[PDB]
Amino acid sequence: DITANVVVSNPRPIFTESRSFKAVANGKIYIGQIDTDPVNPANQIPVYIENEDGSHVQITQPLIINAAGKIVYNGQLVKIVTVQGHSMAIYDANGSQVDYIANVLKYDPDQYSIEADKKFKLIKQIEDKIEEILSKIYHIENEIARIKKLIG
Amino acid sequence: DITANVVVSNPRPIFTESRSFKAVANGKIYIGQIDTDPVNPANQIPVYIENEDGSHVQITQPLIINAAGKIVYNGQLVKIVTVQGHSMAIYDANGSQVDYIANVLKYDPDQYSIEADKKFKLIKQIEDKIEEILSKIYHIENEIARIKKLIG
Amino acid sequence: DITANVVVSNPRPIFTESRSFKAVANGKIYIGQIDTDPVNPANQIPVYIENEDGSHVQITQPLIINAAGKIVYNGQLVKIVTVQGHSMAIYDANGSQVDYIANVLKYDPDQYSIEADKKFKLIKQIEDKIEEILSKIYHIENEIARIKKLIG
């Protein structure tokens, strides 16, 4: 057949209400240290827009949710990233809490390639070191054979 | 620049109809062994609410979907977990099948840290063992040099 | 307690408009090489329906989105896969661009088992090779002890 395990998916998040099927239109998102209350600025962590060229621009919290339920900045849809896993709290436009998640971690595709590069390197180092160890061993075995023959 | 590969996302699932843009309001979800029919109780696997403190309480199937398309128990939104990947079947409030997926596996963030801890330990064990092997080898090399000198 | 880190989730994607809370009804999706414009056929990559038995049938682009926001072929909901991470562009029924994502990578559960099998094998090979190296070393140590005793 063929091995094909990458699924066509929608990576752009949408945020909807908790009790009705509606977007959190003009809602607010706060992002903080895991297992903390991110509405408290002391718990907040840096958030960045990732631009199309892959650069990052730090922005202020809260994140804003549009009528589609999507995060926007300056009238445009944006992808927001952090360095680490994080807590999140979502509020609706009336200031009522929609949701709270203590620990959220979704990696974008760059993390997968970084990890794959790291793994590749690691395995090469171990295998290279094993091969070098075997070469040291076979040289020793040869020295031993020579000694044995020397002494009868 | 900065490396930031954690994307702000919405980890709370929503369940919607297959032919119209609507929540599966008062729908039902069944969870079972991979590649099985989970409506059959003999194929069902334990499901648990994961509470805010991280504890688990086993609950009965089906899981219930509210007007927002979100899983609820006892009038509150809940996160449901299983130990293993699983099949899932979704029915609407009229008893009509909405969807069936044979094999679903989404890990929450705790799995990532468990795996990272396991990896860290593993690599340390291999590297420690390599270093110990090299130390054994260099001691042997030294014994061999001494022998060589002894016998001319 | 119990370790349960598989979260009940909805793996079937839905595609919604960018400025209103609505499905991209009768929309179109194009899938291509990462960081390319997938509306250009020269940038497109093979897309396949993954059938219930796990087989694959290649289909033509664009992918079509129904009134629910879900991908359909021949009047039925389908799961679409590619071999590699990919770019994606979404258009609405009027030909207006809804979204563009340069690099999308979501693995279905089969990738996790392939990777787990590969990891298991790898670690077994390294550990087996370490054990064999130690056995070579202990045999050498024994030969050295014998030599030492022979020569005083």
Side-chain angles (χ1 to χ4, degrees), chain A residues 1-115:
Chain A
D1 194 70
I2 182 193
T3 297
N5 292 331
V6 180
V7 74
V8 174
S9 61
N10 186 357
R12 191 175 295 275
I14 297 144
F15 299 88
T16 69
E17 294 292 344
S18 288
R19 309 289 185 173
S20 76
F21 188 62
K22 288 187 184 170
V24 188
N26 288 352
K28 285 166 175 33
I29 311 182
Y30 300 86
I31 301 296
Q33 307 279 8
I34 68 172
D35 298 329
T36 67
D37 179 358
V39 177
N40 182 353
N43 291 326
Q44 294 173 2
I45 58 168
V47 288
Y48 311 83
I49 293 168
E50 197 163 275
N51 294 311
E52 289 173 349
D53 69 341
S55 60
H56 296 101
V57 328
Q58 181 169 185
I59 60 159
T60 194
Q61 296 195 34
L63 308 177
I64 304 304
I65 301 167
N66 74 351
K70 299 177 182 185
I71 296 170
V72 289
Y73 189 82
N74 234 282
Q76 300 301 330
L77 275 66
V78 291
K79 166 172 179 189
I80 308 298
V81 295
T82 58
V83 176
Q84 69 273 70
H86 57 246
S87 62
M88 181 174 45
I90 304 155
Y91 296 76
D92 77 9
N94 302 140
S96 169
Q97 189 156 6
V98 175
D99 212 344
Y100 169 73
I101 320 289
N103 191 350
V104 194
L105 204 248
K106 185 180 183 151
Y107 279 116
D108 73 20
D110 293 327
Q111 196 61 39
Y112 290 83
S113 32
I114 291 168
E115 295 306 320

